[PDB]
């Protein structure tokens, strides 16, 4: 049954709650972003109102075939009225089309649901600064102090320099980048840009990217693999067997693969600096794991919450074990005591 942390009190609303069947007394289903754990259960047969960003609405219509009459896209940073309740969508700095939702309840409570986010100081100057928030439903994916990682900018710098060096030394090398959902587009796009190539990909992936309103996308992506030296593959295929196989398919156009797997976190971060990262190599294949995250680090999350000073925090991630839940609640108390709220 629908967990409490997907329900907005004082409304008929749910958030990312599409896998429970008909939620009893839900008059509007919000979807924060197009990732499978959050959209699971949507299809062409869904007949209730879905509220989302324009980009998420493009993906609903074109990838899952949800009918147009049930998609209610809302513009960002704009006061809107839904079943008599004022709401605002804000940029979550997650994947394309991902939002946070501000709800202004009739009784005067103000709730922020972050959906999935990577906290950023830029948020401290949006519509959030203009009023107080009583309840925060928080993306706690990496809510433990061992989760440190570099800025997205330092990681893209490392990838571009690595790729440019490799292909300049060997103009017959192929670069491969893994993907399994929308998000992290900058990795493969920035590499293609420095090399003067388009990114080659499957028809289904090309379709997904064309839903995202990315400026100048017809210039950066293609389905013609033959004309490209940056290929996008499913993440699962980013291993020595999958890559040896792919290289065979290219028919002696290329004699080396440099591949990138942008993971969330990996334990090498506690010990290693981005400058200090090395690939796994076998034969003429090298694989780099790079810590490109689209979730808050522990310190980025902590800053955001200590700025916002909510009266109550409701975690939405890692809530399934008692030891996790208990540890998170202890961090929230430290933060409140340190900041004085
Ligand atoms: Ni997500």
């Amino acid at each position: 049954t629908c967990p409490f942390y997907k329900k907005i009190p004082g409304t008929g609303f749910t958030v990312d709650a599409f896998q429970y069947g008909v939620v009893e007394g839900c008059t509007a289903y919000f979807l924060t972003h197009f990732h499978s754990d959050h959209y699971a259960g949507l299809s062409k047969h869904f007949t209730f109102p879905v509220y989302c960003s324009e980009i998420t609405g493009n993906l609903l219509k074109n990838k899952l075939h949800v009918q147009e009459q049930y998609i209610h896209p809302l513009p960002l940073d704009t006061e809107c009225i839904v079943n008599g309740v004022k709401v605002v969508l804000l940029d979550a700095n997650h994947c394309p089309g991902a939002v946070m939702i501000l709800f202004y309840l009739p009784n005067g409570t103000v709730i922020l649901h972050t959906g999935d986010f990577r906290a950023d100081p830029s948020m401290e100057r949006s519509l959030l600064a203009d009023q107080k928030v009583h309840m925060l439903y928080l993306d706690t994916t990496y809510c433990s102090p061992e989760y440190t990682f570099p800025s997205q900018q330092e990681v893209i710098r490392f990838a571009i320099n690595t790729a440019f060096e490799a292909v300049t030394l060997n103009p017959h090398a192929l670069v491969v980048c893994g993907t399994y959902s929308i998000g992290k587009e900058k990795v493969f796009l920035a590499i293609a840009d420095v090399l003067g190539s388009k990114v080659g990909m499957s028809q289904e992936k090309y379709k997904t990217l064309q839903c995202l309103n990315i400026p100048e996308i017809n210039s950066l992506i293609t389905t013609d693999m033959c004309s490209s030296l940056v290929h996008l593959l499913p993440m699962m295929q980013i291993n020595f067997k999958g890559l040896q196989s792919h290289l065979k398919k290219c028919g002696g156009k290329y004699n080396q693969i440099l591949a990138f797997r942008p993971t969330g976190w990996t334990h090498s971060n506690k010990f290693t600096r981005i400058a200090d990262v090395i690939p796994q190599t076998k034969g003429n294949i090298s694989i780099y794991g790079i810590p490109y995250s689209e979730h808050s680090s522990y310190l980025e999350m902590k800053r955001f919450v200590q700025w916002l000073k909510p009266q109550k925090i409701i975690p939405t991630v890692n809530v399934g074990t008692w030891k996790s839940r208990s540890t998170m609640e202890k961090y929230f108390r430290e933060w409140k005591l340190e900041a004085g709220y």
Side-chain angles (χ1 to χ4, degrees), residues 1-23 25-203 205-215 217-240 242-247 249-269 271-281 283-311 313-341:
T1 70
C2 187
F4 70 104
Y5 66 79
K6 293 190 185 284
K7 302 175 168 185
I8 306 304
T11 66
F13 304 162
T14 60
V15 176
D16 301 343
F18 298 92
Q19 62 160 297
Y20 303 92
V22 172
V23 174
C26 175
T27 66
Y29 290 80
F30 281 77
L31 179 62
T32 62
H33 70 287
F34 198 78
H35 282 161
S36 58
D37 278 352
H38 299 261
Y39 67 68
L42 280 164
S43 74
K44 74 178 77 180
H45 310 288
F46 198 82
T47 51
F48 294 105
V50 179
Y51 290 87
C52 57
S53 67
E54 168 179 17
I55 284 162
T56 293
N58 295 342
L59 293 155
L60 293 183
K61 181 202 174 177
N62 287 289
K63 300 290 297 183
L64 299 184
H65 303 292
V66 173
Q67 293 173 43
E68 201 137 75
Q69 73 180 110
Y70 304 106
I71 312 174
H72 307 250
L74 308 169
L76 301 195
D77 301 320
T78 298
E79 291 175 321
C80 302
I81 311 304
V82 173
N83 297 356
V85 175
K86 175 159 76 174
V87 307
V88 169
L89 302 192
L90 303 159
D91 202 284
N93 188 32
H94 185 54
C95 66
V99 302
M100 311 195 281
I101 314 156
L102 254 186
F103 302 91
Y104 294 79
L105 267 45
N107 73 359
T109 315
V110 173
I111 297 167
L112 176 59
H113 196 303
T114 62
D116 282 353
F117 88 137
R118 181 167 187 178
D120 194 74
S122 64
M123 292 173 179
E124 299 163 22
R125 300 171 267 290
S126 64
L127 298 211
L128 271 183
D130 307 28
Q131 87 298 275
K132 158 185 204 67
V133 168
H134 301 79
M135 314 186 80
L136 178 60
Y137 286 69
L138 182 65
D139 161 28
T140 44
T141 294
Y142 298 125
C143 193
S144 192
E146 65 267 39
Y147 301 105
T148 57
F149 30 65
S151 75
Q152 288 173 167
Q153 189 274 331
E154 298 171 71
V155 170
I156 291 304
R157 175 91 298 204
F158 172 80
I160 281 169
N161 284 346
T162 300
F164 179 75
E165 175 181 335
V167 170
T168 296
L169 296 167
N170 181 190
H172 300 278
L174 173 65
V175 171
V176 181
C177 296
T179 182
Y180 42 31
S181 39
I182 63 171
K184 306 178 183 197
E185 289 80 7
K186 194 73 182 170
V187 181
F188 56 86
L189 303 178
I191 293 168
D193 187 60
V194 85
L195 296 176
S197 177
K198 292 202 190 192
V199 182
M201 69 192 66
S202 72
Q203 290 182 243
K205 186 70 183 190
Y206 184 86
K207 185 188 165 169
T208 303
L209 301 185
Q210 287 295 157
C211 298
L212 309 182
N213 304 349
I214 280 179
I217 203 71
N218 298 343
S219 55
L220 311 142
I221 61 171
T222 183
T223 54
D224 174 6
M225 307 284 310
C226 293
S227 70
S228 160
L229 64 148
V230 182
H231 298 175
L232 292 204
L233 295 178
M235 200 70 86
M236 285 191 61
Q237 183 164 11
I238 314 307
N239 54 66
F240 296 110
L243 297 166
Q244 276 163 214
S245 178
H246 184 75
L247 187 58
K249 285 162 248 182
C250 295
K253 206 159 193 300
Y254 307 108
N255 65 354
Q256 183 185 4
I257 286 181
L258 183 110
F260 290 95
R261 293 189 342 89
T263 60
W265 165 84
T266 62
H267 191 55
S268 24
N269 283 303
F271 303 122
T272 324
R273 279 165 144 69
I274 190 58
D276 302 312
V277 173
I278 64 161
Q280 274 194 246
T281 294
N284 60 339
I285 304 174
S286 293
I287 304 172
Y288 281 88
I290 60 166
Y292 190 95
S293 179
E294 290 188 336
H295 295 276
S296 312
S297 81
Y298 176 80
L299 289 173
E300 293 168 340
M301 188 184 304
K302 176 179 190 271
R303 178 180 169 122
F304 179 79
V305 179
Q306 277 186 319
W307 171 78
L308 191 73
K309 306 172 168 73
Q311 294 187 10
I313 306 173
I314 303 160
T316 64
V317 185
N318 303 310
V319 296
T321 87
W322 296 117
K323 184 178 162 208
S324 296
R325 274 187 164 292
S326 178
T327 306
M328 292 186 295
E329 287 188 9
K330 295 170 47 268
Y331 298 133
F332 300 152
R333 189 59 55 182
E334 298 185 15
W335 303 347
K336 183 177 150 104
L337 287 166
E338 185 195 27
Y341 49 108

